[PDB]
C-alpha cells in the first residue's frame, strides 16, 4: 500500500526494508529478486526440459494496486508443472521498465505470472518485452486498462481472459531461487525467466503507465545482489 519506486525517497526501494517490520526481508534477505541474468555464469541443466504449461482461458479481473496493474483470474486458469509439482496460475503483474536484466540489457516491459501449488509453494514465470508489434494478450485488455486512467475504479471485470495468448516460448529459460519484487519481498520463490524476448507496442506500455500512481510510473525494483546463488539455464537443441 505504502512504498515508492523513487531512488532516494524515504519510501523508495533502498528503504523498503525499514518502512515496516512486515517488509524487513526486502532489506535483509540474501535471495532477493530481480537479478542480473549473465550467460557467462549460468549452469546448464538439460534435465530441466522445455517448460510445461497447461493453461486455461477463464474469467478474470483487472486490478490496479496503484503501483502495478495485474490480471487476477477468478477460475482455474490452469497450471505450470515443475518436477511434477503443479503450480496454479493465479495472477499476472506488469512492470515497466523490466526488473530482470539479460546480459546487462533492461527491457521495455516485464510480465510476471504468479503461480501457487496446494503446498503454498510459489513459482513465477517472467516474459521480457521490447517495443515492436503489439502484444496479443494486452490487446484484448487495453480498453479495460484505459478505464483506470482517470476513474476511481481499481477493479474491472475483463471477462474471460486467455493465458495462451501470452508470448511464451517454452524452449529456453533461466531458473533460480529468488523473492517477490515488491514488499514483503518474501523468498522461496522459484523464478523462471523466458529466454525469448516478446514484443509490446509503445501504446500498450503507455496505457499501463497511465494507470498507476505517480510514484510508480516506472515500477521496476532495482537489481539485487546475486550473492553467489546459482542460476540454471535450459535450452532445447535441434540435437
From Swiss-Prot:
CDD domains: alpha_CA_prokaryotic_like. The carbonate dehydratase activity is not substantially changed by the addition of Zn(2+). Pfam families: Carb_anhydrase. Expressed in tuber (at protein level). Its EC number is 1.6.5.4, 4.2.1.1. L-ascorbate binds at residues 68, 93-95, 112, 181-182. SMART domains: Carb_anhydrase. Storage protein of tuber. Involved in protection against oxidative stress. Has carbonate dehydratase, trypsin inhibitor, dehydroascorbate (DHA) reductase and monodehydroascorbate (MDA) reductase activities. Catalyzes the reactions of carbonate dehydratase and DHA reductase independently of zinc and glutathione (GSH). The coupled reaction is capable of recycling a plant antioxidant ascorbate using ubiquitous compounds H(2)O and CO(2). Exhibits antioxidant activity. Able to scavenge 1,1-diphenyl-2-picrylhydrazyl (DPPH) radical. Exhibits immunomodulatory activity. It catalyses: hydrogencarbonate + H(+) = CO2 + H2O; 2 monodehydro-L-ascorbate radical + NADH + H(+) = 2 L-ascorbate + NAD(+). Monomer. Homodimer. SUPFAM superfamilies: Carbonic anhydrase. GO terms for molecular function: antioxidant activity; carbonate dehydratase activity; L-ascorbic acid binding; monodehydroascorbate reductase (NADH) activity; nutrient reservoir activity; protein homodimerization activity; serine-type endopeptidase inhibitor activity; zinc ion binding. Not glycosylated. Residues 1-235 form the Alpha-carbonic anhydrase domain. Belongs to the alpha-carbonic anhydrase family. Gene3D superfamilies: Alpha carbonic anhydrase. Keywords: Allergen, Antioxidant, Disulfide bond, Lyase, Oxidoreductase, Signal, Storage protein. It comes from Dioscorea japonica. Changing residue 112 to A: Slight decrease of dehydroascorbate (DHA) reductase activity. One of its GO terms (biological process) is positive regulation of gene expression. This is Dioscorin dioA3. Changing residue 93 to A: Loss of dehydroascorbate (DHA) reductase activity and carbonate dehydratase activity.
